[PDB]
Amino acid sequence: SVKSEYAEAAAVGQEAVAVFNTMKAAFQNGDKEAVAQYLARLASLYTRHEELLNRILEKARREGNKEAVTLMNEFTATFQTGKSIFNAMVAAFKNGDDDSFESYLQALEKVTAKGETLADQIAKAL
Numbered sequence: 001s002v003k004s005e006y007a008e009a010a011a012v013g014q015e016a017v018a019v020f021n022t023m024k025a026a027f028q029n030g031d032k033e034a035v036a037q038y039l040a041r042l043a044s045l046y047t048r049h050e051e052l053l054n055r056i057l058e059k060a061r062r063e064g065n066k067e068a069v070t071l072m073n074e075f076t077a078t079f080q081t082g083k084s085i086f087n088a089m090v091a092a093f094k095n096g097d098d099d100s101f102e103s104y105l106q107a108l109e110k111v112t113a114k115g116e117t118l119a120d121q122i123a124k125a126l
């Protein structure tokens, strides 16, 4: 069901939260080798999450579930804000700009926390 597909997508999102927090600890500790691996792992999770979200939005559209489509359009837009911040974070790591890395890291945490009420609202709407 589209609802069970959203729960699967929500779990992938929570996997990225977990890996992101370990990555933040590694960054603070200066373990740049770990950071690089976590960033690769996070890119794969976000690419997977985005694909599950697009499939869910398209299905809600085919089902005519107007409220769920509205919420998912808003939620996908916020996801892309997070993705842009992430990709900038990755560039700051490549460049050795720890000041920018810290900045982008905090921004991504705030974008994500803000988007969580909507994330829950979608589960209920599908």
Ligand SMILES: Oc1ccc(-n2ccnc2)cc1
Pocket: 012, 013, 014, 016, 017, 020, 045, 046, 049, 050, 108, 109, 112
């Ligand atoms: O697919 C995702 C979802 C949330 C993510 N995140 C939570 C906190 N900072 C990033 C990252 C990737």
Ligand SMILES: Oc1ccc(-n2ccnc2)cc1
Pocket: 046, 047, 078, 079, 080, 081, 082, 083, 084, 086, 087, 108, 111, 112, 113, 115
């Ligand atoms: O709340 C978030 C967190 C991370 C996100 N992301 C990282 C890479 N692509 C999406 C998107 C939305």
